[PDB]
Amino acid sequence: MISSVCVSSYRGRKSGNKPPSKTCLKEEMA
Protein backbone atom coordinates (compact mmCIF):
# COMPACT_ATOMS: atom_id res chain seq x y z
CA MET A 1 0.00 0.00 0.00
CA ILE A 2 2.53 2.69 1.08
CA SER A 3 6.10 2.79 2.53
CA SER A 4 5.88 -1.05 2.94
CA VAL A 5 3.70 -0.36 6.03
CA CYS A 6 0.44 -1.87 4.72
CA VAL A 7 -0.09 -4.57 2.04
CA SER A 8 -3.41 -3.75 0.30
CA SER A 9 -6.36 -5.58 1.96
CA TYR A 10 -9.25 -6.69 -0.31
CA ARG A 11 -9.47 -5.91 -4.07
CA GLY A 12 -10.49 -2.43 -5.35
CA ARG A 13 -14.23 -3.03 -5.88
CA LYS A 14 -15.79 -2.47 -2.40
CA SER A 15 -18.96 -0.91 -3.96
CA GLY A 16 -17.25 2.53 -3.97
CA ASN A 17 -13.54 2.73 -4.90
CA LYS A 18 -11.26 4.72 -7.26
CA PRO A 19 -11.61 3.17 -10.72
CA PRO A 20 -8.41 2.76 -12.77
CA SER A 21 -10.15 3.54 -16.12
CA LYS A 22 -11.90 6.58 -14.55
CA THR A 23 -9.23 8.47 -12.54
CA CYS A 24 -10.19 11.99 -13.76
CA LEU A 25 -13.23 13.16 -11.71
CA LYS A 26 -11.70 15.77 -9.32
CA GLU A 27 -10.95 13.17 -6.60
CA GLU A 28 -8.83 15.83 -4.78
CA MET A 29 -10.28 18.62 -2.57
CA ALA A 30 -12.88 19.86 -5.12
Side-chain angles (χ1 to χ4, degrees):
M1 202 118 252
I2 188 154
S3 187
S4 229
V5 171
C6 273
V7 169
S8 223
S9 297
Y10 125 85
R11 240 263 208 268
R13 65 118 61 214
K14 67 193 213 286
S15 186
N17 211 86
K18 240 208 77 124
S21 54
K22 279 158 289 289
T23 182
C24 279
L25 62 128
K26 217 67 165 84
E27 293 113 288
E28 65 248 55
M29 197 175 158

Tab-separated table of all heavy atoms in Angstrom:
chain	number	residue	atom	x	y	z
A	1	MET	N	0.852	-1.229	0.000
A	1	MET	CA	0.000	0.000	0.000
A	1	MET	C	0.876	1.263	0.000
A	1	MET	O	0.843	2.040	-0.933
A	1	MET	CB	-0.837	-0.087	1.283
A	1	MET	CG	-2.093	0.778	1.138
A	1	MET	SD	-3.564	-0.270	1.256
A	1	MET	CE	-4.035	-0.204	-0.491
A	2	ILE	N	1.658	1.475	1.035
A	2	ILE	CA	2.529	2.694	1.079
A	2	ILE	C	3.704	2.497	2.052
A	2	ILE	O	3.543	1.974	3.141
A	2	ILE	CB	1.608	3.831	1.550
A	2	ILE	CG1	2.351	5.167	1.444
A	2	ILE	CG2	1.179	3.603	3.005
A	2	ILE	CD1	1.343	6.303	1.259
A	3	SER	N	4.884	2.925	1.657
A	3	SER	CA	6.102	2.793	2.531
A	3	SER	C	6.241	1.376	3.121
A	3	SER	O	6.771	1.203	4.203
A	3	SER	CB	5.891	3.822	3.646
A	3	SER	OG	7.060	3.892	4.453
A	4	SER	N	5.777	0.363	2.419
A	4	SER	CA	5.884	-1.047	2.937
A	4	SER	C	5.216	-1.199	4.315
A	4	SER	O	5.461	-2.156	5.025
A	4	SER	CB	7.384	-1.313	3.044
A	4	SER	OG	7.687	-2.558	2.427
A	5	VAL	N	4.380	-0.269	4.698
A	5	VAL	CA	3.698	-0.359	6.028
A	5	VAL	C	2.450	-1.243	5.926
A	5	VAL	O	2.205	-2.087	6.767
A	5	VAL	CB	3.319	1.085	6.382
A	5	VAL	CG1	2.411	1.098	7.614
A	5	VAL	CG2	4.589	1.887	6.684
A	6	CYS	N	1.670	-1.054	4.898
A	6	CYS	CA	0.437	-1.874	4.716
A	6	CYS	C	0.497	-2.623	3.379
A	6	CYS	O	1.086	-2.156	2.420
A	6	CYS	CB	-0.716	-0.867	4.719
A	6	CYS	SG	-1.255	-0.571	6.421
A	7	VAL	N	-0.106	-3.781	3.314
A	7	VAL	CA	-0.091	-4.575	2.044
A	7	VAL	C	-1.096	-3.992	1.041
A	7	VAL	O	-0.727	-3.300	0.113
A	7	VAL	CB	-0.483	-6.002	2.461
A	7	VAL	CG1	-0.777	-6.850	1.219
A	7	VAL	CG2	0.669	-6.638	3.243
A	8	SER	N	-2.359	-4.271	1.227
A	8	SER	CA	-3.410	-3.746	0.296
A	8	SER	C	-4.801	-3.998	0.884
A	8	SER	O	-5.634	-3.114	0.920
A	8	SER	CB	-3.228	-4.531	-1.005
A	8	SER	OG	-3.323	-3.634	-2.118
A	9	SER	N	-5.036	-5.205	1.349
A	9	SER	CA	-6.357	-5.583	1.961
A	9	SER	C	-7.500	-5.507	0.943
A	9	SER	O	-7.851	-4.448	0.467
A	9	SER	CB	-6.601	-4.590	3.095
A	9	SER	OG	-5.585	-4.736	4.081
A	10	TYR	N	-8.099	-6.636	0.647
A	10	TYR	CA	-9.254	-6.692	-0.307
A	10	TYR	C	-8.888	-6.134	-1.701
A	10	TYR	O	-7.874	-5.489	-1.890
A	10	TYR	CB	-10.366	-5.880	0.397
A	10	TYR	CG	-10.893	-4.770	-0.482
A	10	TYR	CD1	-11.894	-5.042	-1.415
A	10	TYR	CD2	-10.384	-3.474	-0.355
A	10	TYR	CE1	-12.389	-4.019	-2.230
A	10	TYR	CE2	-10.877	-2.447	-1.166
A	10	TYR	CZ	-11.881	-2.720	-2.106
A	10	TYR	OH	-12.372	-1.709	-2.913
A	11	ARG	N	-9.723	-6.400	-2.676
A	11	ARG	CA	-9.475	-5.911	-4.070
A	11	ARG	C	-9.702	-4.388	-4.147
A	11	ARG	O	-9.400	-3.666	-3.221
A	11	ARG	CB	-10.496	-6.682	-4.920
A	11	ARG	CG	-9.762	-7.516	-5.971
A	11	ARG	CD	-9.742	-6.764	-7.305
A	11	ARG	NE	-9.672	-7.831	-8.346
A	11	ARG	CZ	-8.517	-8.235	-8.790
A	11	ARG	NH1	-7.937	-7.595	-9.765
A	11	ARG	NH2	-7.945	-9.275	-8.257
A	12	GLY	N	-10.234	-3.894	-5.237
A	12	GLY	CA	-10.487	-2.426	-5.347
A	12	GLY	C	-11.947	-2.199	-5.741
A	12	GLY	O	-12.302	-1.164	-6.270
A	13	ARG	N	-12.792	-3.174	-5.507
A	13	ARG	CA	-14.226	-3.034	-5.885
A	13	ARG	C	-15.163	-3.136	-4.663
A	13	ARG	O	-16.134	-3.867	-4.681
A	13	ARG	CB	-14.464	-4.181	-6.875
A	13	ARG	CG	-14.294	-5.541	-6.178
A	13	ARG	CD	-15.617	-6.317	-6.217
A	13	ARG	NE	-15.917	-6.517	-7.667
A	13	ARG	CZ	-17.151	-6.520	-8.083
A	13	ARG	NH1	-17.868	-7.600	-7.979
A	13	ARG	NH2	-17.664	-5.442	-8.603
A	14	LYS	N	-14.896	-2.403	-3.610
A	14	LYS	CA	-15.790	-2.466	-2.405
A	14	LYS	C	-17.034	-1.578	-2.595
A	14	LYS	O	-17.365	-0.770	-1.747
A	14	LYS	CB	-14.930	-1.967	-1.233
A	14	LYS	CG	-14.596	-0.477	-1.405
A	14	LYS	CD	-13.484	-0.089	-0.428
A	14	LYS	CE	-13.673	1.364	0.021
A	14	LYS	NZ	-13.274	2.198	-1.153
A	15	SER	N	-17.731	-1.733	-3.699
A	15	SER	CA	-18.959	-0.909	-3.961
A	15	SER	C	-18.682	0.579	-3.680
A	15	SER	O	-19.439	1.248	-3.000
A	15	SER	CB	-20.016	-1.462	-3.004
A	15	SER	OG	-21.264	-0.831	-3.263
A	16	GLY	N	-17.597	1.093	-4.199
A	16	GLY	CA	-17.249	2.527	-3.969
A	16	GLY	C	-15.730	2.660	-3.842
A	16	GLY	O	-15.197	2.790	-2.755
A	17	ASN	N	-15.030	2.616	-4.945
A	17	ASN	CA	-13.540	2.729	-4.902
A	17	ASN	C	-13.028	3.482	-6.137
A	17	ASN	O	-13.723	3.609	-7.127
A	17	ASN	CB	-13.046	1.280	-4.912
A	17	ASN	CG	-11.727	1.174	-4.146
A	17	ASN	OD1	-11.723	1.025	-2.939
A	17	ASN	ND2	-10.600	1.242	-4.796
A	18	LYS	N	-11.815	3.977	-6.087
A	18	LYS	CA	-11.257	4.718	-7.262
A	18	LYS	C	-11.059	3.757	-8.446
A	18	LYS	O	-10.318	2.796	-8.346
A	18	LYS	CB	-9.910	5.278	-6.790
A	18	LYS	CG	-9.926	6.806	-6.903
A	18	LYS	CD	-8.500	7.325	-7.116
A	18	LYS	CE	-8.072	7.083	-8.569
A	18	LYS	NZ	-7.691	8.427	-9.094
A	19	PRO	N	-11.739	4.049	-9.530
A	19	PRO	CA	-11.607	3.166	-10.724
A	19	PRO	C	-10.346	3.525	-11.527
A	19	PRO	O	-10.038	4.690	-11.708
A	19	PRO	CB	-12.869	3.448	-11.534
A	19	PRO	CG	-13.288	4.821	-11.130
A	19	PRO	CD	-12.822	5.030	-9.716
A	20	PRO	N	-9.657	2.503	-11.982
A	20	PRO	CA	-8.415	2.756	-12.772
A	20	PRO	C	-8.742	3.399	-14.131
A	20	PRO	O	-8.054	4.297	-14.576
A	20	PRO	CB	-7.803	1.369	-12.954
A	20	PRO	CG	-8.949	0.424	-12.831
A	20	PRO	CD	-9.934	1.059	-11.885
A	21	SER	N	-9.783	2.948	-14.789
A	21	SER	CA	-10.150	3.539	-16.119
A	21	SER	C	-10.797	4.924	-15.949
A	21	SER	O	-10.866	5.697	-16.886
A	21	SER	CB	-11.139	2.553	-16.749
A	21	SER	OG	-12.222	2.314	-15.851
A	22	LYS	N	-11.268	5.247	-14.766
A	22	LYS	CA	-11.900	6.585	-14.546
A	22	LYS	C	-11.198	7.313	-13.392
A	22	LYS	O	-11.745	7.474	-12.317
A	22	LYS	CB	-13.361	6.283	-14.199
A	22	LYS	CG	-14.152	6.031	-15.486
A	22	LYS	CD	-15.417	5.228	-15.165
A	22	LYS	CE	-15.042	3.783	-14.804
A	22	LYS	NZ	-14.594	3.150	-16.081
A	23	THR	N	-9.985	7.751	-13.613
A	23	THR	CA	-9.228	8.472	-12.536
A	23	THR	C	-9.169	9.983	-12.828
A	23	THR	O	-8.206	10.649	-12.490
A	23	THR	CB	-7.820	7.854	-12.549
A	23	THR	OG1	-7.034	8.441	-11.517
A	23	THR	CG2	-7.143	8.100	-13.903
A	24	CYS	N	-10.189	10.526	-13.446
A	24	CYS	CA	-10.195	11.988	-13.755
A	24	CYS	C	-11.556	12.606	-13.397
A	24	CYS	O	-12.268	13.105	-14.250
A	24	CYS	CB	-9.933	12.076	-15.264
A	24	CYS	SG	-8.157	11.913	-15.580
A	25	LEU	N	-11.917	12.577	-12.139
A	25	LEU	CA	-13.228	13.164	-11.713
A	25	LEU	C	-13.034	14.064	-10.481
A	25	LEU	O	-13.831	14.057	-9.560
A	25	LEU	CB	-14.127	11.960	-11.391
A	25	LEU	CG	-13.529	11.142	-10.241
A	25	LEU	CD1	-14.590	10.925	-9.161
A	25	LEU	CD2	-13.060	9.783	-10.769
A	26	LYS	N	-11.979	14.847	-10.473
A	26	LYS	CA	-11.699	15.768	-9.325
A	26	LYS	C	-11.734	15.014	-7.984
A	26	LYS	O	-12.428	15.398	-7.060
A	26	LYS	CB	-12.795	16.835	-9.394
A	26	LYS	CG	-12.204	18.193	-9.006
A	26	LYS	CD	-11.191	18.638	-10.066
A	26	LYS	CE	-10.888	20.131	-9.898
A	26	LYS	NZ	-9.826	20.202	-8.852
A	27	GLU	N	-10.978	13.949	-7.873
A	27	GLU	CA	-10.950	13.167	-6.595
A	27	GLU	C	-10.230	13.951	-5.481
A	27	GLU	O	-10.295	13.587	-4.321
A	27	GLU	CB	-10.181	11.887	-6.934
A	27	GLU	CG	-10.998	11.047	-7.924
A	27	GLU	CD	-10.279	10.982	-9.272
A	27	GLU	OE1	-10.262	11.986	-9.965
A	27	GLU	OE2	-9.762	9.925	-9.593
A	28	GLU	N	-9.547	15.022	-5.820
A	28	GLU	CA	-8.829	15.828	-4.783
A	28	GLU	C	-9.828	16.698	-3.992
A	28	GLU	O	-11.015	16.429	-3.968
A	28	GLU	CB	-7.846	16.701	-5.580
A	28	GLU	CG	-8.621	17.688	-6.468
A	28	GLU	CD	-8.422	17.335	-7.946
A	28	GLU	OE1	-8.684	16.200	-8.309
A	28	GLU	OE2	-8.024	18.214	-8.694
A	29	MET	N	-9.356	17.739	-3.348
A	29	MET	CA	-10.278	18.621	-2.565
A	29	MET	C	-11.050	19.555	-3.511
A	29	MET	O	-10.732	20.723	-3.642
A	29	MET	CB	-9.365	19.419	-1.627
A	29	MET	CG	-10.196	20.031	-0.497
A	29	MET	SD	-9.098	20.845	0.690
A	29	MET	CE	-10.327	21.961	1.408
A	30	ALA	N	-12.064	19.036	-4.171
A	30	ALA	CA	-12.884	19.863	-5.123
A	30	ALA	C	-12.024	20.381	-6.293
A	30	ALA	O	-12.467	21.295	-6.972
A	30	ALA	CB	-13.429	21.026	-4.282
